[PDB]
């Protein structure tokens, strides 16, 4: 059907040259020569080979709404009536004054342009509207974004544990401002990369890698072409915690009893928990840290309708503690 | 800097064309057809050539046996035409009674080469560039692609038509190729040479130089023989036109064309180029935006089409003015005045039939008063005249309003002319000259600007040459930069270089880019003279 799927000139000339389906100026719709009156000798327009500029380009919305001033951001622009070749849209895209270089592979003709923003350090403006010029910045052939792209310089000031075990695996909470900017994010503690989870305006949450040597470590966050640092905010790697004694050396099938556990560096894990493997089932339960040496834990349930512990007593297949990535304690 | 170049290793070159999407350059030659990159690296080479054949033979040896002796002869590319619609290249040769080739666009794969039927034969003529034409298309399923093509005939009146309207099928293997748009036993979409006119004037022939599609028509600039000027051969350069939608061929018109410079006649076309004028020339030539213009090149007199004179003149025609001369001539014959006046076609002069009609520019010819000629020769506006080195070729383009003209020379040189008759100046002035094949290899008519319009591919007998439209970096000083006047050049003040607006970083800002000599950097020092014996003297600088 001549479009029930395309109410934009760019979408029609985009489809098969086979269909014969083409865009008809006057109607503001698209159908064959057959179905559209020739009031002008050039009233029905078809993409001859694609050498057909298309009128009234419009931008619907664009992703990343914010970006770093340094640039490198991949801008993801989605419109309706854009150009039909890449080599016309290339050079057309700009973010206010800032030159934006578009990407070939990621470009979907007259629906979507993926564009890489250049250096915006020299720009006076904090925010600017996005512009596409189809081939020539002609007065009818220009589109301007409905809302504007914002430049920021993200900053960070605090980390929400500042300490963690050498093996790593700590849930880190970096606080700051403008942290959600741009496209890619990479967090590096001691040069070694943090496993990213989620991003926010105010927070970055990631899981720490293993440290080389215990003590203070630099935190480097790079967003696209912007590399932000803070030597006042450091991360302190601690010697791996140890488990020495559990006091009562027992519990019942449903668990839930107090266990007075003793060891070292226990304050360096925020959420430690007990693990126990009974039969083919693995089960876990909570702990409350008091000192660096003392901890109270609630014993794990092993309730299995397949096996019940005997009156004499029985050792589990495995018993240990989940403390970040210190796996020798598992 | 060095000029990017492609050398013809073994043979002469004949035609060049640029693909509007890719910038790939296709090059017709004797025995060869090349595909080249934008910077003129060889991409693919097709052998089309040395074929065992003989010009005297009708249908060539392939179809019928000929008693005439055969020999290995060269196949000259007569024509070359980009068919973007069917992703290919029409590569029309000679030396097989003029059979046409189809090469695939991106690899030169021979898709087809029809040569069974009589229409698949175009002309015996072995001369390069005496042929031209245009490809015109509609969408698939509708009225299909057509080729309008003129060629010389060599006296083979009954074998070939000089001008024709032919069919272009989607299958290259399809036998219907180069068949006439509408054939009847009475009238076919073709125009033949009458036998009576060849008996009277022995070797009359029509040589087609340039050709272009405009709005809804098809024009041709032609050379013909002495028919009211047996004796000797003297040529008359004329314009031809047809409606694109005229299967009957009734729209044919034919006006003589030339121009005069201080009592010196220039009547032989060497090349032409249809273009725009841009805001500048348009305004003071009195035109609308989309109104077209035709730059041309003529040699002096009406002598020796085979080897013309050095004396050559670049003229100008506005198409609105040629359209008015044709409308004026038709609204005249439809008043019943005089005869049709077309010597070579109609030997006995038929008369103009009066009739009441709305004579428009949309008029596509009618049954009576038929194919007709022209009495008043159409005069062109002269621009530049070379007297020591003959012009050979031309192109032009719109740059930021100002109209730049390109002109090949017999020497292998290109001129870069701002046409300034409509501009403030006294007459259109040469800006710059450039070198291609310095030794004296002439430039050929096929001279095309790139798609990005950054370069201009200049073809010779023996080499293609990528000549940049803009090369302002040869200018060392603000004072010389803006002094050359060739309009692409500005002084990028803070970089102290001469180049275009889009090349000077931050040019849009105040005073960062200079375009008139008055914007040039002017500097003065207060203590101009300081003694060797002095040290660390305070100086004040006004800029
Ligand atoms: C960091 O914090 C933690 C606590 O949060 C802390 O660990 C405890 O520290 C406190 C002192 O601050 C100690 O408590 C003292 O115990 C004295 C007597 O010890 C006997 O009783 C112990 C408690 O019995 C309770 O728990 C058991 C088992 O869970 C339970 O059955 C009972 O019902 C009862 O609730 C008992 O654990 C202990 O057994 C220990 O010793 C044996 C043998 O050596 C060993 O094998 C075991 O492993 C076990 O460790 C023993 O039988 C008691 O006198 C004292 O009372 C004084 O202080 C209070 C308050 O200040 C005054 O009011 C009062 O007047 C007394 O002067 C106090 O109750 C406790 O021993 C620690 N726990 C452990 C496991 O060692 C760390 O020390 C803190 N770190 C610091 C301070 O830096
Ligand atoms: C990064 O993280 C590491 C590890 O967590 C930090 O190092 C620790 O610093 C804390 C500070 O809170 C230390 O606790 C204090 O200890 C001092 C005295 O330290 C001495 O005694 C230690 C315990 O007995 C002992 O481990 C130390 O020996 C280490 O160092 C030597 C030499 O380098 C090495 O060879 C050993 O192997 C040890 O590693 C050392 O001799 C003490 O003054 C403090 O007491 C205060 O608090 C108590 C109780 O509240 C109070 O009673 C006192 O009055 C006093 O106010 C406190 O206990 C901890 O010992 C260190 N741990 C380790 C493993 O080194 C490091 O500081 C962090 N870096 C940064 C930049 O912050
Ligand atoms: C070497 O480098 C120095 C740079 O300092 C150049 O010196 C300048 O030369 C030009 C002429 O060559 C001078 O312009 C002329 O100015 C006079 C007015 O002069 C008065 O005002 C001056 C500035 O306000 C001031 O310096 C003068 O005072 C000097 O003289 C006294 C007394 O001798 C001395 O004590 C001081 O130390 C000063 O040196 C003075 O009060 C003006 O009258 C001139 O115009 C006349 O000429 C023109 C052209 O013919 C004509 O059209 C007019 O009608 C008119 O008759 C002229 O403008 C300039 O003042 C000098 N600058 C300084 C700082 O003295 C010098 O040119 C360089 N030498 C060479 C050889 O190139
Ligand atoms: C088995 O039977 C089938 C089907 O019956 C045959 O297939 C047909 O093959 C013939 C060839 O003989 C095809 O005929 C061709 O049709 C073209 C018509 O296209 C036009 O149609 C309309 C109306 O005319 C136009 O409006 C429209 O714009 C199209 O242009 C003709 O143009 C062809 O003519 C050309 O070739 C012939 C022969 O070489 C010349 O005489 C002509 O001058 C001209 O150059 C051609 O006639 C036909 O399309 C096929 N049929 C169908 C239904 O599609 C098989 O031939 C047969 N097979 C065997 C093995 O016996
Ligand atoms: C085929 O033709 C194409 C063009 O038609 C051509 O490829 C182009 O080469 C030019 C340089 O000749 C390149 O332009 C560059 O763009 C980058 C930005 O991505 C700039 O960094 C470059 O600047 C450098 O060069 C300047 C001038 O010399 C220096 O002043 C400066 O310091 C930099 O060193 C430069 O502007 C461009 O990459 C391509 N064009 C495209 C569209 O990719 C090539 O010559 C031909 N190739 C072949 C194989 O024949």
Author numbering:
A (entry chain A): 806 to 1135
B (entry chain A): 37 to 265, 271 to 584
Authors' account:
Class A plexins (PlxnAs) act as semaphorin receptors and control diverse aspects of nervous system development and plasticity, ranging from axon guidance and neuron migration to synaptic organization. Plexins are large type 1 transmembrane proteins comprising typically ten domains in their extracellular segment, a single membrane spanning region that is predicted to be helical and a conserved, cytoplasmic region that contains a GTPase-activating protein (GAP) domain with a Rho GTPase-binding domain insert. All our PlxnA ectodomain structures show autoinhibitory, intermolecular “head-to-stalk” (domain 1 to domain 4-5) interactions, which are confirmed by biophysical assays, live cell fluorescence microscopy, and cell-based and neuronal growth cone collapse assays. This work reveals a 2-fold role of the PlxnA ectodomains: imposing a pre-signaling autoinhibitory separation for the cytoplasmic domains via intermolecular head-to-stalk interactions and supporting dimerization-based PlxnA activation upon ligand binding.
We determined crystal structures of the full extracellular segments of mouse PlxnA1, PlxnA2, and PlxnA4 from eight crystal forms providing a total of 13 independent structures that range in maximum resolution from 4 to 10 Å. The 4 Å dataset was obtained by dehydrating crystals of PlxnA11-10 that diffracted otherwise at best to 6 Å resolution (see Experimental Procedures). In the crystal structure of PlxnA1-full ectodomain, the sema domain (domain 1, “head”) together with domains 2–9 (“stalk”) lie in a 230 Å long curve that forms a ring-like conformation. All consecutive domains are arranged in a beads-on-a-string-like fashion, with short interdomain linkers (up to two residues) and extensive interfaces (buried surface area ranging from 716 to 1,172 Å2), each interdomain interface having a small hydrophobic core. The ring is closed only in the 4 Å structure of PlxnA11-10, by interactions between the sema domain and domain IPT5 (domain 9). This relative compaction can, most likely, be attributed to the dehydration procedure applied to generate this crystal form. The membrane proximal domain IPT6 (domain 10) is positioned perpendicular to the ring formed by domains 1 to 9, and the IPT6 C terminus points away from the plane of the ring. All our PlxnA full ectodomain crystal structures have an intermolecular plexin–plexin interface in common. This interface is formed by blades 1–3 of the sema domain of one plexin molecule and the outer side of domains 4-5 (PSI2-IPT2) from the ring of a second plexin. In the 4 Å PlxnA11-10 structure, the interface has a buried surface area of 1,303 Å2 (355 Å2 between sema–PSI2 and 1,008 Å2 between sema–IPT2) and a complementary electrostatic charge distribution.
